[PDB]
Amino acid sequence: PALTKSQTDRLEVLLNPKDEISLNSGKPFRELESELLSRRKKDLQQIYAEERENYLGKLEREITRFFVDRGFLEIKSPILIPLEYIERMGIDNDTELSKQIFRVDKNFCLRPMLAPNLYNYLRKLDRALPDPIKIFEIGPCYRKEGKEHLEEFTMLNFCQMGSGCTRENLESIITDFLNHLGIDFKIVGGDTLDVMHGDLELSSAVVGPIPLDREWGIDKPWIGAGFGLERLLKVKHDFKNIKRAARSESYYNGISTNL
Ligand SMILES: C/C=C/C(=O)NCCCC[C@@H](N)C(=O)OP(=O)(O)OC[C@H]1O[C@@H](n2cnc3c(N)ncnc32)[C@H](O)[C@@H]1O
Ligand SMILES: [Mg+2]
Numbered sequence: 728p729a730l731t732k733s734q735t736d737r738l739e740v741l742l743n744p745k746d747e748i749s750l751n752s753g754k755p756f757r758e759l760e761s762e763l764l765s766r767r768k769k770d771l772q773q774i775y776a777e778e779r780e781n782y783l784g785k786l787e788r789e790i791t792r793f794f795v796d797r798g799f800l801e802i803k804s805p806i807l808i809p810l811e812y813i814e815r816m817g818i819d820n821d822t823e824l825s826k827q828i829f830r831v832d833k834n835f836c837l838r839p840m841l842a843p844n845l846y847n848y849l850r851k852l853d854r855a856l857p858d859p860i861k862i863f864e865i866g867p868c869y870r871k872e873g874k875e876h877l878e879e880f881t882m883l884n885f886c887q888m889g890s891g892c893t894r895e896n897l898e899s900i901i902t903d904f905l906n907h908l909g910i911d912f913k914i915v916g917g918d919t920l921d922v923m924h925g926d927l928e929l930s931s932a933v934v935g936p937i938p939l940d941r942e943w944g945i946d947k948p949w950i951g952a953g954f955g956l957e958r959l960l961k962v963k964h965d966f967k968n969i970k971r972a973a974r975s976e977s978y979y980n981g982i983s984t985n986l
Pocket of ligand 2: 930
């Protein structure tokens with residue numbers, strides 16, 4: 728008896744990349760299932776006995792160390808933000824991204840991006856800190872939305888404002904960062920550059936200034952980029968589905984919790 732599509736879906740939940748196992752081998756479902764459950768339980772037991780770190784938390788800590796060591800100030804800003812910030816980002820009620828916003832009250836929303844809060848920090852810190860101003864944030868962002876898109880994800884955004892805000896310097900920070908993480912990439916590109924892993928977008932990056940700056944009281948050169956942490960994990964651990972890298976009750980470090 729061939730496996731049913733339902734059975735195949737069930738085994739794929741339990742399959743980790745590099746199991747080196749085939750599902751067209753003439754072994755019954757119940758036995759293939761039992762083998763995989765066994766391995767996945769062992770994977771959790773090993774994490775529990777040895778490291779005990781969540782991949783998303785650990786990646787955040789590794790990224791944080793990278794940027795702190797390179798001169799960037801760690802920011803932790805509100806996740807719940809004024810709706811007015813979305814309009815001031817130039818996102819009108821007719822825009823597709825406007826339909827993607829999770830509204831909370833009359834006046835607030837879950838941030839879909841880190842830029843508005845970072846804009847405010849750039850303007851404020853420019854009164855206190857020497858040139859250039861270098862900051863970053865890592866945290867939750869939200870968009871109503873795929874095997875590449877989550878509704879609840881985690882962004883890194885870094886930026887620099889003042890001197891040294893060139894395309895060359897932006898590409899160099901991106902290059903050092905991803906070679907540090909061990910992630911293969913290419914950069915394709917007032918500029919806008921995309922950092923790609925094959926067909927998967929890891930980042931959009933920007934060389935300012937841009938006209939939007941003035942709405943935020945910013946009038947200096949700047950560079951920046953945003954990376955999705957779940958996308959980075961997906962590539963690093965070779966997950967077939969990005970849900971394996973997300974905040975979840977169904978997966979822990981890419982291992983099914985439904986055992
Ligand atoms: C003061 C300015 C600061 C500054 O830093 N400016 C330049 C920042 C670049 C602008 C940039 N930060 C931006 O505007 O969101 P975008 O939709 O482009 O997404 C950026 C990345 O987030 C990830 N990502 C986005 N949506 C996702 C989803 N639904 N699921 C998973 N990952 C996702 C993915 O890795 C994507 O490439
Ligand atoms: Mg983009």
